[PDB]
């Protein structure tokens, strides 16, 4: 081919990966990767630019972000604004894009039988209406306004602004209405001309595309060649920044920051050269592995034993092509905030220990083999994120090593590691403390976020104490990981294998569901367990004691379980309104041992009083910090409280938290473990006799050490959902004391969860999805967060709209109703071919098979918690979905303005439309629930 400059030899992939690959480079400089998978249900594609926001003009901050926002609103060949997202929505696809300081990555997925139909327009994106600009400015401004009160954003932009102001690293990457609209209009700047002249940097020599589909590599080749050979090449050099943004006057500095949430954090930063070109060794991943370690003899073990720190993170943080950072961030207790100097001193003592011992080839080899195993048995990723990631990393690595570069280490060089250790010195350190105790003691304000902070010079006396750091006996190198898996044998599929989970055990003690892996065949396993006990959610006191018990358990087992978590065997342990939930996922080789240890700590728990006080104070800080959550999250929380029969508010939990005492908890743990039910789901590379052996092991341990007795069936009480009256409208109103934005959630309730109602609600939500996005966000520009979809809980379902905007919730609500009438007219005037097109799009949406094991076990567990046990739900409900006709009109007239069974409840969080009735304001949730009926429970299978 003349339009292909070169073709890669072969793509180094995993032997377990069945997908085909073919890399090539076109004549215009685009780095193309092709992935053929004849079995995928949805195809995907992604194009990555390497410019980003660090190349923004100094007078227009956020221009690349605004451009990424703008490329979706139509092109020359296709001028309509939402024809792209409407095409993807009508063909069971989605799209998105992000913009990092050195990247601008666009990505999308769609059904496998319209890949070219979508990819043509996606290519038109890279081959500007005034009204669309003036409208999208408000969307960017609502995005930044959404990111104003976010602590990570505040500290991020503050770290950008505390460096050299003349360096592009200090630029504001998001942008807002001032920098995009107000300031350019005041300075006579034509933002549209700036978009056209910027779209001099969008050259083909700095673009990397990745396409994944069912078609053959030759068809994908001819397609990408045809649609991308016409991209003009301008030979734009890749931007580099050899000068580090942090100069001497910015080093050895202390920054006192006041956060929004009541958090206590410590940030240590070391400027380092760009280590990207050292991807074959990854000394930042090595030093991060050693410093951030949590096992015995680590830094976090000492910081925890001294009662100063609870969690520690340390490693390499990416900066740009010319500069990078090496950060160590920790959380602070009330005592650790006063001993920050001692914490940093211990940090430099651990670093000095690493400089004294030197590099460790056995540690490097252990990381190499571990990463090789984790890469070989890596789960099959989702097409959109996979193509986006590969497209993002194509600029850094050759075509043959693009799949294995960030994962496989090959050469061990200690000169680099010793050099970075030479860079980790007190003369090149930056310290930032974040605490509320600095309130009123700050003198500086950040420009973009209004962050209050103070800047001081670190005393040369303290720097000298750091320079004379001796060797600490409490800091030792980690030992050999005893959780490294060595048995990858796939157990043969039993003859009694079932495509869906089967009930192989049903006793009064436990109920065991089991399924042998017959689709992925990977040496992994997911072991889910739910412990039912009425004392878990009987009152806020016992719920707080349960969360404190689980948190103390995980905190005590963190140091021991960090090696298994590093060996690809992780676990999650969280409390639920029905009892505890424990999940152990990963390699089944050494899974039963660690699981046995976790049960042993469940039944032999000894509470430390210091850990109890620290963790209790942390939970108090969490319940206090819920007031700083985002308005839409507060709306979902309030709607949850209103709809659920029994629910304790975080104010009740916070008030009852002070009454929790150590004798009460020590008397509460055996009271909880005295009467239990167990519902398990074992799904992985294990056999039936192995699953029965593990379950019987757990039961025998719980009985032996905890004397656990089964529960009575009459005590299996599930919660009902509040039933709204016909033609009834209720509005609950609260205020957000942190964010200056308003939130709103409208919820219409349906009858119950049956096949017909499920397909009605899902089909209608499929029809109104893209029109909801486009009407409420693209055209009217109400806010940045506009969502609409089905809501299911307690076996009852409904339709929900969730909007975060500046405008008042009553106006937002009236516009929602007017949009409902608009969709009524649209469906009444809709053609049968478009209706059947939504039917097919929803069918492809629902019949999408899971890509990895954890997703399938998550679907099974989702069918277990609901106690419906409908494993064949997709086939039956889609088979009924293809038989529906434009029923939907009667459903809209029955459930959704003058419907005889309209059930509407609105949540308003304070910062032509039809006439709406007078809503009943909710004064008290308890009276609200007492005055209204409750829905029945879904019958079991």
């Amino acid at each position: 081919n003349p339009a292909i400059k070169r073709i890669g030899n072969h793509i180094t992939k995993s032997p377990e990966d069945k997908r085909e690959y073919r890399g090539l480079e076109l004549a215009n400089g685009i780095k193309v990767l092709l992935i053929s998978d004849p079995t995928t249900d949805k195809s995907s594609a992604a194009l990555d630019v390497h410019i980003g926001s660090l190349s923004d003009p100094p007078n227009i901050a956020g221009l690349s972000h605004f451009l990424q926002h703008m490329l979706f609103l139509g092109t020359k060949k296709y001028p309509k604004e939402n024809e792209y997202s409407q095409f993807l929505s009508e063909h069971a696809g989605s799209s998105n894009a992000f913009t990092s300081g050195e990247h601008t990555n666009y990505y999308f997925d769609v059904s496998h039988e319209h890949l070219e139909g979508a990819l043509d327009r996606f290519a038109q994106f890279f081959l500007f209406d005034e009204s669309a600009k003036d409208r999208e400015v408000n969307a960017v401004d609502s995005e930044h306004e959404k990111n104003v009160m976010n602590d990570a954003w505040r500290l991020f932009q503050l770290e950008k602004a505390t460096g050299n102001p003349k360096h592009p690293f200090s630029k504001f990457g998001t942008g807002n209405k001032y920098t995009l609209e107000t300031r350019p209009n005041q300075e006579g700047i034509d933002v549209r001309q700036e978009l056209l002249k910027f779209h001099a940097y969008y050259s083909s020599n700095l673009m990397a595309v990745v396409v994944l589909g069912r078609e053959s590599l030759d068809d994908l080749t001819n397609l990408v060649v045809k649609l991308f050979s016409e991209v003009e090449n301008k030979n734009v050099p890749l931007p580099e920044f050899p000068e580090h943004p942090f100069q001497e006057e910015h080093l050895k500095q202390l920054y006192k920051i006041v956060p929004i949430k009541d958090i206590r954090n410590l940030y240590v930063t070391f400027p380092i050269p760009d280590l990207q070109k050292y991807y074959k060794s990854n000394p930042g991943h090595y030093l991060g592995h050693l410093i951030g370690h949590e096992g015995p003899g680590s830094l976090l073990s000492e910081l925890k034993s001294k009662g100063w720190v609870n969690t520690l993170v340390g490693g390499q943080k990416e900066g740009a092509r010319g500069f990078m950072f090496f950060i160590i961030n920790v959380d602070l207790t009330e005592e650790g905030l006063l001993h920050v100097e001692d914490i940093i001193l211990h940090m430099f003592q651990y670093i000095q220990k690493l400089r004294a011992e030197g590099p460790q080839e056995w540690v490097f080899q252990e990381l190499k083999d571990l990463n090789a195993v984790a890469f070989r048995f890596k789960d099959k990723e989702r097409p959109r994120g996979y193509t986006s990631k590969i497209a993002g990393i194509l600029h850094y690595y050759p075509l043959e090593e693009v799949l294995t570069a960030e994962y496989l280490l090959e050469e061990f060089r200690p000169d680099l590691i010793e050099m970075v250790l030479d860079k980790l010195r007190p003369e090149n350190v930056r310290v930032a403390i974040v605490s509320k105790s600095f309130e009123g003691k700050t003198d500086r304000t950040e420009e973009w976020y209004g962050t209050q902070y103070k800047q001081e010079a670190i005393p040369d006396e303290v720097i000298k104490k750091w320079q004379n750091a001796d060797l600490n006996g409490k800091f030792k190198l980690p030992t050999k990981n005893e959780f490294i898996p060595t048995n990858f044998e796939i157990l043969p599929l039993e003859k009694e294998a079932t495509p869906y989970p089967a009930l192989i055990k049903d006793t009064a003690m436990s109920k065991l569901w089991f399924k042998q892996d017959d689709k992925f065949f990977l040496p992994k396993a997911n072991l889910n367990f739910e412990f039912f006990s009425p004392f878990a959610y009987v009152d806020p006191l016992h719920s707080n004691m349960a969360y404190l018990y689980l948190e103390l358990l995980k905190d005590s087992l963190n140091e021991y379980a960090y090696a298994a978590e590093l060996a690809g065997l992780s676990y999650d342990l969280q409390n639920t309104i029905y009892g505890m939930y424990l999940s152990v996922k990963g390699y089944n080789d050494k899974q039963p041992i660690l699981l046995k240890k976790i049960i042993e700590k469940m039944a032999t728990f000894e509470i430390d009083e210091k850990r109890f006080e620290i963790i209790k104070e942390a939970y108090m800080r969490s319940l206090n910090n819920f007031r700083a959550e985002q308005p839409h999250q507060h709306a979902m929380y309030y709607l949850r409280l209103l709809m659920t029969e029994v629910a304790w508010t975080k104010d009740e939990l916070k008030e009852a938290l002070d009454d929790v005492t150590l004798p009460r908890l020590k008397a509460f743990i055996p009271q909880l473990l005295s009467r239990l039910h167990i519902e398990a789901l074992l799904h992985g590379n294990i056999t039936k006799q192995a699953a029965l052996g593990i379950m019987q092991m757990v039961e025998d341990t719980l009985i032996e050490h905890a004397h656990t007795k089964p529960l009575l069936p009459s005590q299996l009480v599930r919660y009902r959902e509040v039933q709204l009256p016909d033609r009834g409208w209720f509005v609950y109103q609260q205020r957000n004391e942190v964010h200056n934005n308003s939130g709103i959630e409208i919820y219409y309730q349906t009858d119950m969860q049956s096949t017909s109602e499920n397909m009605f609600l899902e089909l209608f939500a499929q029809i109104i999805s893209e029109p909801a996005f486009n009407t409420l966000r693209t055209k009217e520009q109400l806010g940045y967060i506009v969502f609409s979809g089905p809501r299911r809980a307690n076996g009852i379902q409904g339709l929900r709209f969730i909007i975060q905007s500046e405008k008042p919730p009553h106006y937002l609500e009236s516009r929602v109703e007017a949009f409902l009438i608009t969709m009524e007219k649209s469906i009444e005037d809709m053609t049968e071919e478009a209706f059947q097109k939504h039917i097919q799009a929803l069918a492809i949406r629902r019949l999408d098979k899971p890509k990895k094991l954890s997703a399938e076990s998550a679907k099974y567990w989702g069918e277990i918690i609901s106690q419906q046990y409908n494993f064949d739900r997709d086939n039956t409900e889609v088979a009924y979905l293809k038989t529906l006709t434009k029923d939907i009109i009667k459903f809209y007239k029955e459930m959704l303005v003058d419907a005889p069974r309209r059930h509407k409840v609105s949540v308003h969080v304070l910062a032509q439309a039809p006439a709406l009735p007078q809503p009943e304001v909710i004064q008290n949730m308890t009276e609200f629930k007492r005055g209204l009926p409750l829905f029945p429970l879904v019958k079991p299978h």
Partner: antibody, heavy 127, light 102 residues
């Protein structure tokens, strides 16, 4: 294909000067270290000098400190000999490190290989 | 620092071991043909250079050993052990000449 070429050797009267040139091809001298190693007539190998262009580091042997001066231009290496005695007559070779961005300032030595060499230029010092 | 022995003689297919004794705890191995430029044999004390016959083996006991189990008639050269050292230092030995006995 990576290779090196030496040029500049010849005959010089004792006490004279000479400039040896190690022109590199196939790579970038900016991202590699260059070594100069001579061999005496009938004797074993002997390291003369070394340079890391990235870190701007130079290294001389204890036999010649103020008489030799190593340097590099970004894509050719240069070894300067300002005063040659009758004992400096030898065959001079230049080589490169196999690994990239080798760190000069180190406490522990890491002996990597010198994969690619050159034919070398012979210098004799006689009247 | 030091190398042993000064010279050695063995037959074809015979096993030959050269003991180079030297900071740095590793060593490199090079093979210089008579007149021609030296050729890299072993960079890291464990592994060998790409394209080098498998009959060459680098070992360490303090003292490092180069091992040639099967000796070919084309392996006649002078072998030198290289030692890197701090302050960016490189040192060689006096070499070992292997004489083939037919």
């Amino acid at each position: 294909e990576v290779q090196l070429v030496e040029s500049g050797g010849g005959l010089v009267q004792p006490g004279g000067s000479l400039r040896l040139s190690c022109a590199a091809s196939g790579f970038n001298v900016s991202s590699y270290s260059i070594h100069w190693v001579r061999q005496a007539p009938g004797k074993g190998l002997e390291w003369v000098a070394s340079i890391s262009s990235y870190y701007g580091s130079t290294s001389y042997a204890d036999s010649v400190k103020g008489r030799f001066t190593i340097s590099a231009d970004t894509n050719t290496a240069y070894l300067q000999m300002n005063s040659l005695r009758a004992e400096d007559t030898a065959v001079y070779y230049c080589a490169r490190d196999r690994v990239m961005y080798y760190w000069s300032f180190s406490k522990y030595g890491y002996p990597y290989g010198m994969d690619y060499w050159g034919q070398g230029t012979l210098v004799t010092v006689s009247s | 620092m030091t190398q042993s022995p000064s010279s050695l003689s063995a037959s074809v297919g015979d096993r030959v071991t050269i003991t180079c004794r030297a900071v740095s705890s590793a060593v490199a191995w090079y093979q210089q043909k008579p007149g021609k430029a030296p050729k890299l044999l072993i960079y890291s004390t464990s592994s060998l250079y790409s394209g080098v016959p498998s009959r060459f083996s680098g070992s360490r006991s303090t003292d490092f050993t180069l091992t040639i189990s099967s000796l070919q008639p084309e392996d006649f050269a002078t072998y030198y052990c290289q030692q890197s050292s701090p302050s960016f230092l490189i040192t060689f030995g006096q070499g070992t000449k292997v004489e083939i006995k037919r």
